Amino acid sequence: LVHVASVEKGRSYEDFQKVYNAIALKLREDDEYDNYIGYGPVLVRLAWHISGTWDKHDNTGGSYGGTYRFKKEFNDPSNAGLQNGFKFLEPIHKEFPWISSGDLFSLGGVTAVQEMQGPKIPWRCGRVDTPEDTTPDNGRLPDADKDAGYVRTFFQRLNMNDREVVALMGAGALGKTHLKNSGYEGPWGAANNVFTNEFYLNLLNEDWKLEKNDANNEQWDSKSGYMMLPTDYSLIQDPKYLSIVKEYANDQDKFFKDFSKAFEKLLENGITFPKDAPSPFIFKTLEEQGL
Ligand code: HEM
Numbered sequence: 001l002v003h004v005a006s007v008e009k010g011r012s013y014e015d016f017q018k019v020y021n022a023i024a025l026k027l028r029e030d031d032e033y034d035n036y037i038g039y040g041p042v043l044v045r046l047a048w049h050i051s052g053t054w055d056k057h058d059n060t061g062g063s064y065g066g067t068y069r070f071k072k073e074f075n076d077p078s079n080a081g082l083q084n085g086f087k088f089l090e091p092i093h094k095e096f097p098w099i100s101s102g103d104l105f106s107l108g109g110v111t112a113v114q115e116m117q118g119p120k121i122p123w124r125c126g127r128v129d130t131p132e133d134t135t136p137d138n139g140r141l142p143d144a145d146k147d148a149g150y151v152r153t154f155f156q157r158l159n160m161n162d163r164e165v166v167a168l169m170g171a172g173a174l175g176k177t178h179l180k181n182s183g184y185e186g187p188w189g190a191a192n193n194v195f196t197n198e199f200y201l202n203l204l205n206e207d208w209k210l211e212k213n214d215a216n217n218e219q220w221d222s223k224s225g226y227m228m229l230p231t232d233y234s235l236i237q238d239p240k241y242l243s244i245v246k247e248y249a250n251d252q253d254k255f256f257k258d259f260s261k262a263f264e265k266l267l268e269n270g271i272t273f274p275k276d277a278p279s280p281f282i283f284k285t286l287e288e289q290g291l
Pocket residue numbers: 041042044045048080081142143144151168169171174175176177178179181182183184229231
């Protein structure tokens with residue numbers, strides 16, 4: 001199953017930087033969403049969920065085709081809550097109708113991280129919309145009530161190794177869980193809309209208590225008011241994961257670098273890039289632009 005990247009006709013860096021800016025500006029202006037957390041976290045969750053359907057065995061799913069736009073995928077119960085990120089982007093697609101769904105959903109994720117003071121994520125254009133019949137079935141995203149073995153095994157299908165898995169979960173400790181959404185409730189840390197390595201720190205230095213939530217699900221709770229999913233907590237149970245958790249807790253920059261590489265790989269899985277394709281773009285932030 002081959003998916004070759006095709007640059008949107010005649011567009012270049014400037015075109016996409018325009019699209020970046022538009023997303024970044026609305027991020028700035030629609031600041032009260034989710035109790036003034038903003039749309040950042042939901043955008044990077046959306047970029048991960050549309051990429052997380054990929055299966056390295058037959059090259060199905062993945063971000064290439066933008067199939068989250070079809071009812072089947074849009075209505076995946078594991079995607080509950082993502083409708084708000086979709087609706088956020090909708091005005092922008094209208095403003096820039098030449099960009100493909102897949103490029104817009106993945107650039108939304110890159111924009112959020114950079115605007116929330118995360119690392120730069122190089123990004124490549126060229127995803128191409130594919131028909132509804134290419135939509136992956138529900139069920140390829142991970143469960144939260146499982147263990148390390150589960151986590152390790154799951155991510156193998158996305159060709160992610162241990163270091164890559166731990167960098168990706170870390171995920172700047174952004175946003176929170178919502179009971180109505182996932183049957184989980186609460187944030188991973190104090191800065192839910194600044195990209196940091198706080199998750200690693202919190203994991204290792206909080207006092208966690210295994211409790212049941214109002215959705216009758218167990219989660220780990222801290223006196224500080226933070227929470228961890230069973231799959232999150234499993235990272236300190238596994239001896240291989242734990243060592244990496246400790247490395248990222250002790251080195252902000254290493255973590256920043258590692259995440260950038262894994263997130264780009266995640267966004268690019270399944271896509272074939274012609275040698276003649278353009279190099280990846282590195283977008284400047286609003287701040288770097290003085291906007
Ligand atoms: C074993 C893997 C993972 C599991 C089981 C999982 C599960 C969860 C669940 C239960 C939520 C709550 C959704 C809601 O209630 O609104 C969620 C939120 C989110 N996750 Fe994941 N996830 C994992 C991996 C990832 C990774 C790899 C990233 C992205 C790089 C990611 C980014 C997010 C973010 C940003 C949120 C917060 C969204 C917002 O605040 O609305 N997750 N995750």
